[PDB]
Amino acid sequence: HNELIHDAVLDYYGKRLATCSSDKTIKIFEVEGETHKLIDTLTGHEGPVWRVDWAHPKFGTILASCSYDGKVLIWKEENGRWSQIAVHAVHSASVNSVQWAPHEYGPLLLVASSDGKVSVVEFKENGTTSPIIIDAHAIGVNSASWAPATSRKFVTGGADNLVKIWKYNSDAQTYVLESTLEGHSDWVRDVAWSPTVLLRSYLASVSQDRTCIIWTQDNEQGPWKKTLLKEEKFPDVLWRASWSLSGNVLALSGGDNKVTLWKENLEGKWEPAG
Amino acid sequence: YTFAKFSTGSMLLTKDIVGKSGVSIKRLPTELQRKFLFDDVYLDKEIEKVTIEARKSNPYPQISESSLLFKDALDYMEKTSSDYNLWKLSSILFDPVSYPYKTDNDQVKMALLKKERHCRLTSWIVSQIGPEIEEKIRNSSNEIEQIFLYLLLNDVVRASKLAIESKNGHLSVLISYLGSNDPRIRDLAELQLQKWSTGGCSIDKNISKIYKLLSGSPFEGLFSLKELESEFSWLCLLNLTLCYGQIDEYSLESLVQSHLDKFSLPYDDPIGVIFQLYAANENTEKLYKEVRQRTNALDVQFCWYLIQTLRFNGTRVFSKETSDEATFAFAAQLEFAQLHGHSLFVSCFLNDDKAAEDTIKRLVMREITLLRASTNDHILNRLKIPSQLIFNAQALKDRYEGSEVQNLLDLAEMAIVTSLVQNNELKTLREILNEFVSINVFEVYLKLVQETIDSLISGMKIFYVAACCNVMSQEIVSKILEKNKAKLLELPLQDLMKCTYKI
């Protein structure tokens, strides 16, 4: 019995899968082609676990999950026995996304909850949490993705149909908003920064209004460029939108039971692939 | 509701309630469709053809010499497949010819090389059009037309023979000139054609065609074979230009270009594309870019191989950015095919050192395990993968699988925590001395063995879980051994129970 899992994540080396469902449990699997043997079940949430996310193995085996009970729970495998080492629930509503930073930033976490907040939880020398939070969106935040870089930044998708690009500032010590972008007529479900250290940067912003805008910024200066992936509404509301590391391929999880795939061509415009 | 993101090992997980986990491990459909690529022998022999040098802005490998030729791939393909035709024709036009015999001076050499290339190209075209024309000869009901068709197969002698046999003797004589570029005959033939085409009550339809061939400009003309556009493969007519056409005064390229200027080729036809890229000479890249946005006849792999050959043979010129674009694309296709060694190898052909560094590093660290199996995987990490990168990556894989020699080459304290035998401690101390946190060093120095300093160090370390308690217990035992007194009592002034037992 597992009729509705909400999120799954793969570890750096892809040996250990972590699915999370609505019955509150987080199941860990040892994958091997066909056969994923169930190795664990983790019960510590008071509502459907929306998302899970491993951290960089540089920090051992850590997995931050966020669930409907408004609480972010950090887990850790310890000699082959899992244990909830920390928790971070400074958010008064259902926590939606949770995504670790690039491992060069430390062990930073990115939480994004419906109380219009988004936190960056550092884990200090005592391993204790060092929360520095910001207000992100009015009617709630559905998602928040990190950006790689070599001047740190992330993106957030809102319930006011916004897509925001925040940047760290030593003057403020809190991430200062640097640019907001408007293009959807309904709750911005997911936002994704692309890991392509190439000539430009790409953002795929899926939404409830069955659109997927692509914000391609030329460089560090010239603002983004709006590009409705295709100019027809998808047969059903879209949920997830993920970039590929090698290649800059885009995967779109529409509520139409297939996942589409879109690649950029020399027109600059985007074309299906599969 | 659905969810799907991309894996580290770029592949896709989606909701799937037919499986056991509630997700599906999908092998991302690879565009990379070319069999020999999944065979590691090809890759080994392909690395044998390369000279790898470290960059002048970082230690990461990038290619200094390549001896790759379109020629080389041909062994791994069927001589029957259209692909083989593409690669072969590409070899004929682009791979350097060698002329083994010594030549009085070097411009003669150049000339001979031109003749050789020309002869191979035209033999090949005749190979292709062969059955087409032979079919046409099968169905002809007229001898002079057959003679013409034999000229279409660049068989001057059989044409001459049929002429002889069909009682067309003068024609026969004329034919024997085909393929000598005698400008006298050229202008005479053209003259005869004008005289006919000014009065000339009637001349046989195919005799005029043959004269037009002798004219050296069979479409370029005023009695033009251009209308044969509708009766013959474009390649067949191109054969006509290449064989007769005016070989000596023109270069192979500008000749082919001359022909192409008279006839649009189908956008989708790739042997067409190759001729266009060959003829385009002065701006191959320009055309290549045009070809890119117009068609997919040239695949990712081919475009990369092409660009690389031409680059490393001086044959032609491509932007650092276009060569890198091609290279990225192919390396990516390869990585989507779980062909990491091969993707890595390709990744090395990057000009942008920054990008090469990132790509290479990222991939090696993410995928180190698979990249350390056979000797064909060894030569791989003996591309010139930086010692640092290889071991560093290997360090990460150990921390995650629950290393030390790597770290030796915060985190160190965590390793020391994991470690808590004497010989190993000594070796670690030696490594630390070679490298030269301080508190741990003091503790180690004490363990190898002033007492008060060691005590203060241990206390400081305690201020900074099972391992630590064990170390504390060991220190306690040592102190107890030392007391066996007043100084020891002065220094002192389950853990609680032990402390009580001590007092």
Side-chain angles (χ1 to χ4, degrees), chain A, chain B residues 1-402 412 415 459 466-467 486 492:
Chain A
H1 202 68
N2 223 194
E3 300 279 1
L4 181 87
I5 290 161
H6 271 283
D7 198 1
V9 183
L10 273 175
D11 54 350
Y12 198 81
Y13 296 94
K15 236 151 213 280
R16 229 177 302 177
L17 161 73
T19 60
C20 81
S21 75
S22 307
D23 51 35
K24 309 167 191 172
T25 59
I26 301 163
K27 301 172 192 304
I28 273 61
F29 294 76
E30 279 296 340
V31 193
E32 275 182 358
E34 288 272 347
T35 68
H36 13 53
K37 177 202 161 191
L38 181 66
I39 262 215
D40 258 300
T41 306
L42 310 187
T43 292
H45 280 297
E46 294 161 307
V49 191
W50 294 145
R51 283 212 196 177
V52 278
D53 193 36
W54 303 85
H56 197 101
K58 177 185 191 169
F59 316 127
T61 297
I62 293 173
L63 156 56
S65 79
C66 68
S67 173
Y68 182 67
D69 70 311
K71 303 183 188 166
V72 186
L73 270 173
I74 284 78
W75 311 69
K76 160 150 196 159
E77 194 174 54
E78 213 72 87
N79 316 319
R81 302 204 163 192
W82 281 91
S83 42
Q84 299 172 33
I85 285 181
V87 67
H88 184 259
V90 308
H91 297 296
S92 55
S94 172
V95 183
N96 306 285
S97 80
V98 58
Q99 191 197 63
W100 301 96
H103 71 276
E104 295 84 352
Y105 297 165
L108 302 188
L109 191 69
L110 196 66
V111 180
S113 172
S114 315
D115 61 312
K117 285 199 171 176
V118 168
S119 59
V120 181
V121 181
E122 189 146 53
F123 289 74
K124 299 191 195 173
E125 305 193 329
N126 293 19
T128 53
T129 62
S130 180
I132 277 84
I133 309 96
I134 46 161
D135 298 345
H137 283 111
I139 319 182
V141 186
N142 298 163
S143 181
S145 275
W146 271 104
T150 311
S151 38
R152 318 183 167 176
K153 301 179 189 174
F154 58 80
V155 53
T156 52
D160 58 326
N161 313 352
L162 289 177
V163 185
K164 288 183 179 192
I165 301 293
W166 304 74
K167 188 188 184 179
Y168 181 55
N169 221 292
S170 295
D171 294 41
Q173 304 278 36
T174 198
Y175 279 81
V176 182
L177 177 60
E178 193 180 354
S179 271
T180 302
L181 301 169
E182 281 197 40
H184 302 281
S185 66
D186 208 331
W187 282 41
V188 179
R189 281 306 196 179
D190 203 352
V191 286
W193 205 307
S194 185
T196 172
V197 186
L198 186 273
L199 303 187
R200 72 186 63 184
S201 296
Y202 307 84
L203 297 175
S205 60
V206 139
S207 178
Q208 192 98 231
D209 66 318
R210 302 170 243 77
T211 46
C212 175
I213 299 165
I214 299 173
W215 312 95
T216 62
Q217 200 178 26
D218 318 326
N219 62 308
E220 269 202 330
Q221 295 179 7
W224 302 87
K225 297 189 157 170
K226 202 184 197 166
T227 311
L228 295 168
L229 181 75
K230 70 171 181 201
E231 303 195 318
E232 294 134 342
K233 286 161 162 184
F234 294 86
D236 199 52
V237 173
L238 307 182
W239 308 117
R240 292 275 174 77
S242 196
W243 295 105
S244 87
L245 293 156
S246 175
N248 211 59
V249 181
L250 180 58
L252 290 187
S253 301
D256 24 310
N257 288 5
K258 168 68 178 163
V259 193
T260 54
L261 298 159
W262 304 82
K263 48 178 186 188
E264 184 181 45
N265 59 43
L266 285 81
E267 268 280 340
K269 297 153 194 189
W270 300 75
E271 206 164 340
Chain B
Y1 184 72
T2 311
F3 62 86
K5 281 172 186 167
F6 269 105
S7 167
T8 324
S10 284
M11 64 195 134
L12 228 298
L13 293 185
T14 319
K15 189 186 169 174
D16 186 54
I17 61 188
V18 178
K20 185 264 179 72
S21 171
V23 287
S24 65
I25 305 88
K26 303 283 193 169
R27 185 104 312 144
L28 160 50
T30 318
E31 298 148 278
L32 203 83
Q33 286 174 335
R34 202 170 252 137
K35 280 173 188 154
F36 65 73
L37 280 169
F38 307 139
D39 178 313
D40 301 325
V41 167
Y42 174 91
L43 177 58
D44 216 298
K45 301 183 159 185
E46 200 172 60
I47 313 217
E48 298 202 67
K49 309 252 200 173
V50 208
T51 297
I52 321 299
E53 143 200 312
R55 280 310 89 173
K56 281 146 197 176
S57 62
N58 70 49
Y60 281 79
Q62 266 142 102
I63 284 71
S64 171
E65 300 296 316
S66 140
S67 64
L68 281 327
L69 306 183
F70 296 98
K71 184 189 296 181
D72 304 323
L74 293 166
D75 295 333
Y76 307 84
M77 341 183 94
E78 266 204 325
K79 298 196 177 180
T80 208
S81 50
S82 51
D83 208 24
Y84 182 89
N85 283 339
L86 214 205
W87 285 75
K88 173 77 135 171
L89 174 63
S90 298
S91 183
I92 291 173
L93 300 170
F94 292 109
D95 286 337
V97 192
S98 50
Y99 188 80
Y101 317 119
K102 293 263 144 180
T103 337
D104 287 304
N105 82 42
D106 214 278
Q107 303 158 355
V108 180
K109 191 188 199 175
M110 278 311 118
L112 294 173
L113 291 158
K114 177 193 171 176
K115 284 323 178 63
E116 190 68 274
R117 188 179 309 276
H118 175 262
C119 163
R120 310 253 199 79
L121 167 64
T122 198
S123 309
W124 176 86
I125 292 177
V126 167
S127 312
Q128 312 302 295
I129 67 179
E132 192 195 354
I133 299 306
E134 268 148 3
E135 239 303 283
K136 290 186 152 293
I137 298 175
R138 233 186 311 294
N139 311 320
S140 69
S141 310
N142 161 305
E143 308 248 58
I144 311 78
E145 176 182 51
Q146 292 176 42
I147 295 169
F148 176 77
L149 295 170
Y150 283 109
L151 303 177
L152 287 184
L153 300 170
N154 199 21
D155 196 325
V156 167
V157 169
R158 260 186 306 170
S160 228
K161 284 176 181 175
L162 177 48
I164 282 307
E165 288 173 298
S166 54
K167 190 62 186 135
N168 302 285
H170 295 100
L171 220 186
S172 189
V173 174
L174 300 186
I175 304 278
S176 74
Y177 301 146
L178 295 169
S180 330
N181 190 204
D182 192 302
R184 305 174 281 141
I185 297 291
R186 237 161 55 197
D187 305 344
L188 258 354
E190 177 66 13
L191 182 51
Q192 184 62 93
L193 258 10
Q194 291 164 347
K195 280 182 148 311
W196 288 333
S197 61
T198 335
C201 100
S202 303
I203 218 305
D204 176 284
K205 288 168 177 181
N206 297 297
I207 290 184
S208 62
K209 291 175 198 175
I210 300 175
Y211 270 71
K212 193 56 165 195
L213 299 180
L214 298 144
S215 85
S217 317
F219 318 98
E220 346 187 326
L222 90 114
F223 227 115
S224 189
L225 303 184
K226 198 185 204 295
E227 71 191 335
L228 304 180
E229 195 172 5
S230 65
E231 303 298 313
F232 296 87
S233 174
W234 60 267
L235 199 67
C236 167
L237 302 201
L238 163 74
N239 200 33
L240 293 177
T241 300
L242 292 175
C243 288
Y244 307 135
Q246 208 154 304
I247 292 147
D248 287 301
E249 290 83 354
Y250 284 84
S251 65
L252 228 315
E253 296 85 337
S254 28
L255 190 60
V256 173
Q257 189 43 257
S258 145
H259 187 88
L260 268 16
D261 285 329
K262 274 108 203 163
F263 310 97
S264 328
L265 302 191
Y267 270 109
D268 294 289
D269 184 341
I271 49 257
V273 181
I274 270 54
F275 279 117
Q276 303 188 46
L277 290 175
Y278 176 66
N281 191 295
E282 299 127 326
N283 45 291
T284 297
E285 174 177 75
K286 179 166 155 278
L287 172 59
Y288 171 70
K289 276 188 176 160
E290 271 153 83
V291 183
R292 235 51 250 284
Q293 307 171 311
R294 294 194 163 165
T295 330
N296 283 302
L298 299 196
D299 61 74
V300 188
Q301 170 180 10
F302 181 91
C303 293
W304 171 82
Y305 199 105
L306 181 148
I307 287 170
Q308 260 30 247
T309 324
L310 305 199
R311 230 181 62 177
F312 287 95
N313 282 119
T315 305
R316 237 75 140 180
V317 278
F318 281 90
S319 332
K320 299 265 197 159
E321 27 279 300
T322 314
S323 163
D324 283 355
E325 191 170 63
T327 313
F328 276 106
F330 182 34
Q333 295 313 330
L334 290 161
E335 206 186 293
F336 287 155
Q338 312 292 112
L339 294 162
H340 301 302
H342 211 306
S343 157
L344 189 44
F345 169 50
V346 173
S347 304
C348 306
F349 294 77
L350 265 44
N351 294 113
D352 178 20
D353 301 333
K354 205 82 176 161
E357 172 163 345
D358 170 45
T359 309
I360 298 262
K361 170 186 305 196
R362 208 179 38 70
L363 170 57
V364 172
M365 302 210 289
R366 177 190 76 194
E367 292 294 331
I368 18 162
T369 301
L370 278 71
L371 296 169
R372 298 243 290 192
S374 342
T375 297
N376 98 283
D377 294 273
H378 216 186
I379 304 157
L380 283 182
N381 289 259
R382 318 138 147 196
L383 262 32
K384 302 283 177 153
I385 302 304
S387 291
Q388 195 62 211
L389 174 61
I390 308 160
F391 98 73
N392 256 10
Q394 184 58 252
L396 189 66
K397 187 77 193 200
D398 302 347
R399 169 111 91 167
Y400 169 88
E401 286 194 2

